[PDB]
């Protein structure tokens, strides 16, 4: 695993530094690495593929060393090295696709393919080169039990969920109370409603609350908070809880009163913010607890006072909502986000070669089903496959 990154690092540098006309002292230490790759790899033989429609290929290495005697590199020296690099870079593609496609349930952090088990001998350890990427550095710190961290831009921490809750209801569905929400990606939009507009509430104030637990602990997040849910603002018809009938929701929107956002960790309040919108921070949390309340306005112009009567026909329903959005955070387990394409490389290999459903991952690599039940057996497999997908992205985009 450490020597699979070390093969790809000095094939990436060999296509970049060994160019025509360059001075020899620019590449004087790469050629000592590239010659010492070849000496270790000669005489061995490998075999990749076999699962699904992934074809079986056999690999055999018998190459010669590079020359170490020029002052400026010429077109003979480049063209005799390109037909050696192009055989290794085809070998690393078929080892990385052989490993992203396999999985185990007992110990997923171990190598699973036949070729990567064979590269983990002490014969092949002399190919080891620097480990400077983000995923190979966190592969080594976490293997010694030291603290790691991945930096994300808009991480997919919330599974998809769109539902509601009725704290007061009747079969006519004309005097209701409760909340509605959408949790999707890295964004929460909750909105509380009350049809009577707190005409009989004590002190004309109705209290709402919405608690979102996370799956993993986030660290040093940057969060944007805005006092409107724009998705629950228009008239719509909504089905009932069991799909029997439908009910109508015609909102008018007040401002949210007495907003309190809390950031919990094992039930302890780490951060809190009271009527403070814009950008906020959250240093360490795993549970977000939103709290906001509706207050009936005590003074109303004649255009407003017609909307909220005392009797039963309520044609304009009051609505109070919020909107939260995580911009960037630092987690310790691997996730998906909006910047890098490591999830897209894993699913595209499995979909292309028609791979059967195994014992660990959900069918079709569904991210909503995978972050919902994000077991420690799935975490060790998901890190092992995102790290191999990161190695393949250096050579083949």
């Amino acid at each position: 695993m450490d020597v699979l990154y070390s093969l790809s690092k000095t094939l990436k540098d060999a296509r970049d530094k060994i160019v025509e006309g360059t001075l020899y002292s620019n590449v004087s230490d790469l050629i000592q690495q590239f010659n010492q790759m070849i000496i270790t790899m000669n005489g061995n033989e490998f075999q990749t593929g076999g699962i699904g429609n992934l074809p079986i290929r056999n690999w055999n290495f018998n190459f010669g060393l590079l020359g170490t005697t020029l002052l400026n590199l010429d077109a003979n020296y480049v063209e005799t090295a390109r037909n050696t690099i192009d055989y290794f870079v085809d070998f690393v593609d078929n080892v990385c696709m052989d490993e992203m496609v396999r999985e185990s349930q007992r110990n997923g952090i171990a190598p699973q393919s036949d070729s990567l088990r064979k590269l983990s001998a002490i014969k092949f350890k002399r190919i080891n080169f620097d480990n400077s990427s983000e995923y190979i550095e966190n592969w080594n710190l976490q293997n010694r039990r030291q603290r790691t961290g991945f930096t994300f831009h808009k991480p997919n921490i919330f599974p998809y969920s769109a539902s509601f809750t009725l704290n007061r209801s009747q079969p006519a569905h004309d005097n209701l109370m409760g909340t509605m929400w959408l949790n999707a990606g890295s964004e929460i939009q909750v909105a509380g409603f009350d049809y009577s507009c707190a005409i009989n509430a004590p002190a004309n104030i109705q209290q709402f609350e919405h608690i979102v637990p996370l799956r993993r602990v986030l660290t040093t997040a940057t969060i944007t908070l805005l006092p409107d849910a724009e998705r629950f603002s228009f008239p719509r018809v909504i089905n009932s809880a069991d799909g029997a009938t439908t009910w109508f929701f015609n909102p008018v929107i007040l401002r949210p009163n007495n907003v309190e956002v809390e950031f919990l960790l094992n039930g302890q309040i780490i951060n809190t913010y009271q009527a403070r919108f814009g950008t906020i921070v959250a240093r360490n949390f795993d549970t977000i607890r939103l709290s906001f309340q509706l207050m009936r306005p005590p003074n109303m112009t004649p255009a407003v006072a017609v909307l909220f009567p005392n009797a039963q026909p309520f044609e304009h329903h009051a609505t109070v909502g919020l909107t939260l959005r995580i911009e960037s955070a630092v987690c310790e387990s691997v996730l998906a986000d909006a910047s890098e394409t490591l999830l897209a490389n894993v699913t595209s290999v499995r979909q292309e070669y028609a791979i059967p459903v195994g014992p660990v991952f959900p069918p079709g690599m569904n991210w909503t089903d995978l972050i919902t039940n994000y077991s420690p057996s799935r975490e060790d497999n998901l890190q092992r496959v995102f790290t191999v997908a990161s190695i393949r992205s250096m050579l083949i985009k």
Binding site: F164, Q170, A172, S240, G243, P309
Partner: protein, 275 residues
């Protein structure tokens, strides 16, 4: 968990169920209310037999639809007792009985919860906007005498009954709004009348009103700033009363689409003033 008020959580992706509007026609019942001058114009006895064949086309069985009749709005309003599942009574417009029609629809379309009253012992007051005084009988004549904080009348003597203010005389149903928060003294002639205070809970769902002829007057809310027109208020214009009856048999799906079952009839509303 009959009296507990637990919340419910439902998704927004559940598929809809089937049509269900043809099962309700099998199980439920229907009652019709018409004035007794309808059968005078009809000139038939078998028109109850006739129409029951016409409801069978729309889906109702032969034993579901019931027919009831009354003489006028005054004598129907003595004690309106409405028993079947879905009730539909069509009244006739009168230009002079303008308040008496809207006092009938205040009882029927809403649901009142009533406590008894004893005039001889006690002095009465209304607490909020929901408390009205509903008196019905053969002949009701109500007189009021408001009192101050010292039990003395304001413009009335508590011994003489002729100085009393008067709000109604000789009706079949009177709904009385007085100033909420003042102790009063009453002079109802309780030989033929019976008064009890009531407070409004919500709408009575399973009944509709079809006004027959005349302009749009109806005022549920005894409140000057509010006169709402619900979906269970209907008006049609008449020339003959066959054409009225073919209209209601044709559109039975739209009459029943806008009225639900009575929420107090269900086994769900167990300890929430059932039925």
């Amino acid at each position: 968990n009959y009296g507990i008020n637990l919340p419910i959580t439902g998704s927004m992706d559940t598929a809809y169920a089937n049509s269900t509007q043809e099962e309700t026609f099998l199980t439920s019942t229907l009652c019709l209310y018409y004035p007794t001058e309808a059968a005078t114009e009809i000139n038939d006895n078998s028109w109850k037999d006739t129409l029951s064949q016409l409801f069978l086309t729309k889906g109702w069985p032969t034993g579901s639809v019931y027919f009831k009749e009354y003489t006028n709005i005054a004598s129907f309003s003595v004690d309106p007792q409405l028993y079947c599942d879905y009730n539909v009574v069509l009244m006739k417009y009168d230009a002079t009985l303008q308040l008496d029609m809207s006092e009938l629809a205040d009882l029927i379309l809403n649901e009142w919860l009533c406590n008894p009253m004893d005039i001889t012992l006690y002095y009465y007051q209304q607490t909020d906007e929901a408390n009205k005084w509903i008196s019905m009988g053969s002949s009701c004549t109500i007189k009021v005498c408001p009192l101050n904080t010292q039990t003395l009348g304001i413009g009335c003597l508590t011994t003489d009954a002729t100085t009393f203010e008067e709000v109604a005389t000789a009706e079949k149903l009177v709904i009385t709004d007085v100033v909420d928060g003042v102790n009063h003294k009453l002079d109802v002639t309780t030989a033929t009348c019976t008064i009890r205070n009531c407070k409004k809970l919500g709408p009575r769902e399973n009944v509709a009103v079809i006004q027959v002829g005349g302009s749009d007057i109806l005022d549920i809310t005894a409140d000057p700033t509010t006169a709402p027109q619900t979906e269970r208020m209907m008006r049609i214009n008449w020339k003959k009363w066959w054409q009225v009856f073919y209209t209601v048999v044709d559109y039975v799906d739209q009459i029943i689409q806008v009225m639900s079952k009575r929420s107090r009839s269900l086994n769900s509303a167990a300890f929430y003033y059932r039925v």
